[PDB]
Amino acid sequence: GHMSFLTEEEQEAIMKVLQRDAALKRAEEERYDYLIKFLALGDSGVGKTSVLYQYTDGKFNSKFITTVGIDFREKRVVYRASGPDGATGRGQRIHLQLWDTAGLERFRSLTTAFFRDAMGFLLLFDLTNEQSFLNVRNWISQLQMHAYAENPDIVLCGNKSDLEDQRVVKEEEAIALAEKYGIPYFETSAANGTNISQAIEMLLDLIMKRMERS
Amino acid sequence: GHMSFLTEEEQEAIMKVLQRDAALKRAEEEDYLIKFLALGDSGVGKTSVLYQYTDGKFNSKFITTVGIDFREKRVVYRASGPDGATGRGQRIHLQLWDTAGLERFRSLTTAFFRDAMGFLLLFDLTNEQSFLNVRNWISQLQMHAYAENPDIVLCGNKSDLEDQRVVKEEEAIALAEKYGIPYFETSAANGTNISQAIEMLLDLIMKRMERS
Ligand SMILES: Nc1nc2c(ncn2[C@@H]2O[C@H](COP(=O)(O)OP(=O)(O)NP(=O)(O)O)[C@@H](O)[C@H]2O)c(=O)[nH]1
Ligand SMILES: Nc1nc2c(ncn2[C@@H]2O[C@H](COP(=O)(O)OP(=O)(O)NP(=O)(O)O)[C@@H](O)[C@H]2O)c(=O)[nH]1
Ligand SMILES: C=CC(=O)Nc1ccc(S(=O)(=O)N2CCCC2)cc1
Ligand SMILES: C=CC(=O)Nc1ccc(S(=O)(=O)N2CCCC2)cc1
Ligand SMILES: C=CC(=O)Nc1ccc(S(=O)(=O)N2CCCC2)cc1
Ligand SMILES: C=CC(=O)Nc1ccc(S(=O)(=O)N2CCCC2)cc1
Ligand SMILES: [Mg+2]
Ligand SMILES: [Mg+2]
Numbered sequence: 001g002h003m004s005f006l007t008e009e010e011q012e013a014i015m016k017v018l019q020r021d022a023a024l025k026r027a028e029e030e031r032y033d034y035l036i037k038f039l040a041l042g043d044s045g046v047g048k049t050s051v052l053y054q055y056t057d058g059k060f061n062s063k064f065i066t067t068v069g070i071d072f073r074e075k076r077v078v079y080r081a082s083g084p085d086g087a088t089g090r091g092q093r094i095h096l097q098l099w100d101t102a103g104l105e106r107f108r109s110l111t112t113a114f115f116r117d118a119m120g121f122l123l124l125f126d127l128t129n130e131q132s133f134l135n136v137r138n139w140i141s142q143l144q145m146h147a148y149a150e151n152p153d154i155v156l157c158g159n160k161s162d163l164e165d166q167r168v169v170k171e172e173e174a175i176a177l178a179e180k181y182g183i184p185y186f187e188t189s190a191a192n193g194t195n196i197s198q199a200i201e202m203l204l205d206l207i208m209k210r211m212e213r214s
Numbered sequence: 215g216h217m218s219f220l221t222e223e224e225q226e227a228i229m230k231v232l233q234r235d236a237a238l239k240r241a242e243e244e245d246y247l248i249k250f251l252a253l254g255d256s257g258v259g260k261t262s263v264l265y266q267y268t269d270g271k272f273n274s275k276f277i278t279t280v281g282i283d284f285r286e287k288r289v290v291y292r293a294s295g296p297d298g299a300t301g302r303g304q305r306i307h308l309q310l311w312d313t314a315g316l317e318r319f320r321s322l323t324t325a326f327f328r329d330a331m332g333f334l335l336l337f338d339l340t341n342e343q344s345f346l347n348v349r350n351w352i353s354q355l356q357m358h359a360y361a362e363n364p365d366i367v368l369c370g371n372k373s374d375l376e377d378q379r380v381v382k383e384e385e386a387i388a389l390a391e392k393y394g395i396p397y398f399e400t401s402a403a404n405g406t407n408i409s410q411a412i413e414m415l416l417d418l419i420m421k422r423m424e425r426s
Contacts, residue, residue, distance in 0.1 A: 006217035006318065014321040018358060022327065025360045069321070106219045109228040109281070113325045116239070146232060148239050 013068045014110070021072065024097065032076065033093040038203055039118035041111065042139060043132035044103030046124045047159040050190030052098045055200055060191045067102040069110050074098070079208055094204065115146050120153035120207040122200070127158045127187065128166040136177060153206040154183045157199050162189035217318045220281070227280045228322070235284065238309065249309040249329050250415055254336030254351060255344040256315030259371035262402035263336065264310050267412055272403050279314040281322050286310065291416055293424070306416065327358050332365035332419045334411065337386075339370045339399060340378040345386065352393060365422060366395045367415040374401040 028035050040048040049067055054060055056075050075098065078091040099118060101111035115121075123139055125132040136156065143152060156178050158169060171187070178185035184206070186199040220228070239247075252260040261279055266272055268285045287308050293301035311330060313323040333355055337345040348368065355364050368390050370381060383399070390397035398411040 004219075006219060008215065011217075011321045015324060015358075018321075018324050018327075022358050022360050025328070026362050029361065070325075105225070109220060109225050109232070110322050110325060112229060112232055113322070115236070117328065146229075146236050148236055149243075150240055 010068045014070055017071050024074070028095070032095050034079075035095050035097065036119055036204060036207055037097040037099065037117055038120040038122060038207065039099040039101065039114060040122040040124065041101045042103055042124035043126070043129070043135050046103070046126040046129065046132050047190045048103070048122070048124050049100050051122070051124065051157065051159060051188065051196060052100055054190045054193050055196045056098070058193065062191075066104070067100060067107075069102045069107045070099070070114060072097055072099045077204075079204060081208065081212070082205070092208075094208075096204070098200075112142065112146050115143070116148050118147065118152075120155070120203045121147070122157060122203060123154055123183075124157045124159050125169070127160050127169045128163050130168045133158070133169045133174070133177075140181060140183075153203065153210060154181075155199055155203040155206065156183045156185050157195075158185070158187045159190060161187040161194055162191050224280050228282055231281075231283050235309075238286075242307075245305050246307065247309060248306050248331060248416060248419060249311065250332040250334060250419065251311035251313060251326060251330035252334045252336065253313050253323070253355075254315060255338070255341070255347050258315065258336045258338040258341065258344050259400075259402045260315065260336055261312055263334075263369065263371060263400060263408055264312055266402045266405050266408050268310070270405070278316070279312055281314045281319045282326060283312045284309055285312065289413075289416070291413075291420060293420065294417065304420075306420075308412075308416070324354075324358055327355075328360045330359070330364075331361075332415050333359070333367075334369060334415055335366050335395075336369045336371050337381065339372045339381050340375050342380050345370070345381045345389075348389060352395075365415060365418040366393075367411050367418075368395050368397045369407075369411050370397070370399040371402060373399045373406060374403045 040052060042048055044066060050060060052073050056073050075096045077094050077096060079094045080091050081089040099114055121143055123136060125136050143154060158174050174185055184202050186195040188195040188199055252264060254260055256278065262272055264285050268287050289306045289308055290303040291306045292303050295301065311326055335348060335351055337348050355366060370386050386397055396414055398407040400407040400411055
C-alpha cells in the first residue's frame with residue numbers, strides 16, 4: 001500500500017479527545033476529592049488500551065484496534081494510605097484519568113507531549129515479544145528526559161501473561177531489569193485481569209505517597 | 215486531502231523542543247513562570263512577532279514553523295492601581311509558545327493549550343481570509359482552552375505594508391468589541407505595538423491571577 005496518511009477522520013478523533021480533556025480539566029476547576037492522572041505507554045501492540053479497558057470495565061476485546069495517537073479513560077476509586085504499620089487510613093476519594101498512548105513512531109511527538117499531564121507512568125511490554133522488552137530501557141530514558149518530575153514514578157507491566165505457550169521474556173530478566181531501576185514489576189493479562197488493578201493501585205500508591213511528603 | 219505524517223526530521227525537531235520545555239519546567243520546580251501561546255493562520259507572522267519581541271531582529275525569509283517552538287524573555291511587570299499606583303516590579307519569566315498554523319499540525323499544536331495561560335491571536339492586515347478565520351480561531355480557543363473565557367489579545371500584523379493592506383480597520387475593531395478582546399495592529403518588521411500587545415496580555419494574566 002501507499003504510505004498511510006493523516007486522515008480527516010483521525011485528526012477529528014484526536015481533537016475530540018482534546019475537547020474532552022479541556023472539558024474535564026475545566027470541570028474539576030469549579031471546586032472526586034482529588035484528581036490523579038497517569039499515562040500508559042509502550043511499544044505498540046503490547047496491550048496498553050486493553051489493560052485499561054479491563055480495569056475500568058472488566059471486559060476484553062480480542063480484535064486489535066490500534067490507537068489513534070492519544071485517548072484516555074476515567075475511574076472513580078477509593079485510595080487507602082498505608083505504612084509499615086498497617087495504617088490503611090481513611091479512604092480518600094480519588095478521580096483517575098488514565099491516559100493511553102499510541103506506541104507507533106508516527107505518534108511519538110504527540111504522545112510525548114502528554115507527559116506534562118502525567119503524575120506517574122504505566123510502562124508495558126509484551127511477554128510474547130522480546131523486542132518490546134528490550135525497548136523498555138529506551139522508554140524509561142524517554143521518561144526521565146521528557147517527564148516533568150525527575151526520576152518519576154514508573155510501574156512496569158509485562159502483559160499477555162495469559163499466553164504462556166508464547167512467552168519469550170524470562171521472568172528473571174524482567175525482575176532484574178526492574179530491580180536495576182528500582183521499579184515495581186507485575187506480570188499482567190488484559191484478558192483475565194490478572195494483576196491489572198494490583199499494578200495500578202501500586203502506581204497510585206506511588207503517586208499518593210509522593211504528594212504526602214510536600 | 216493528503217496530509218503526510220511527520221518526517222523523522224520534523225519529529226526530531228519537535229522532540230528537542232519538548233525536551234527544552236521539560237528541562238525548563240523542572241528548573242522552575244526548583245519568579246513566576248508566565249506562559250502564553252501565539253496562534254493564527256499560517257504566514258500571518260507568529261514567529262516573526264515573537265523574534266521581534268525577544269531579540270529585536272526580523273528575518274524576511276519565510277521559514278515555516280515545524281509544529282511547535284517557544285522563546286523566552288525575562289521581564290519586569292508592575293501592577294496598575296488608581297492614579298497609576300504602579301506597584302513593585304515583579305519578575306516575570308515568560309515562556310512564549312509558537313505554533314504552526316497549517317491545519318496539518320492542528321492536532322499537535324492544540325495539545326499545548328493546556329500550558330498556555332493566555333493567547334495572542336494574529337491575522338494578517340494584508341490577507342482578508344486570515345482575518346475572517348479569526349472567528350473560527352476564537353471558537354477553537356473557547357472549546358479547547360484549559361480555563362474558560364480565555365484571555366486573548368488580537369493582533370493585525372504586518373502593518374508596515376500599507377500599500378498591501380486589505381483588512382478594514384472598522385471590521386477589526388468591531389470584531390474585537392464583539393468579543394471583549396483588546397486589539398493591536400502590529401509589525402514584526404519594525405516593532406510597532408509588539409511590546410504593547412504582549413505586555414497587555416501579561417497584564418490580563420497578572421490581573422486575573424490576582425483575583426483568586
Ligand atoms: N491474549 C491476550 N491478548 C492480549 C492481551 N492484551 C492485549 N492483547 C491483544 O493484543 C493486541 C494489542 O492490544 P492493544 O491493547 O490494542 O495494544 P496497544 O498497546 O494499545 N497498541 P497501540 O499503542 O498501537 O494502540 C490486541 O489484539 C489485543 O486483544 C492479553 O493480556 N492477552
Ligand atoms: N513586512 C512584514 N513581513 C512580515 C511581518 N511578519 C511576518 N512577515 C513575513 O511574512 C512571512 C511570515 O513569516 P512567519 O513569521 O513565519 O509567519 P508565521 O505566522 O509564523 N507562519 P507559520 O504558522 O507557517 O509558522 C515571512 O516572510 C516574514 O518575513 C511583518 O510584520 N511585516
Ligand atoms: C511528573 C510528576 C507529576 O506529578 N506531574 C503533575 C503533577 C500535577 C499536575 S496538576 O494537574 O494537578 N496541576 C494543577 C495544579 C498544579 C499542577 C500535573 C502533572
Ligand atoms: C522510577 C520510578 C519508581 O518506580 N520509583 C521511584 C523513583 C524515584 C523516586 S523519588 O520520588 O523518591 N525522588 C525524586 C524526587 C525526590 C526523590 C521515587 C520512586
Ligand atoms: C489568568 C488566567 C490563567 O492564567 N489561566 C491559566 C493559568 C495557568 C495555566 S498552567 O498550564 O500553566 N498550570 C497548570 C499546570 C501547571 C501550571 C493554564 C491556564
Ligand atoms: C482579553 C480577552 C479576554 O477574553 N479577556 C477576559 C476574559 C475573561 C475575564 S473573566 O473570566 O475574569 N470575567 C467574565 C466573567 C466574570 C469575570 C476577564 C478578561
Ligand atoms: Mg492502543
Ligand atoms: Mg511560524
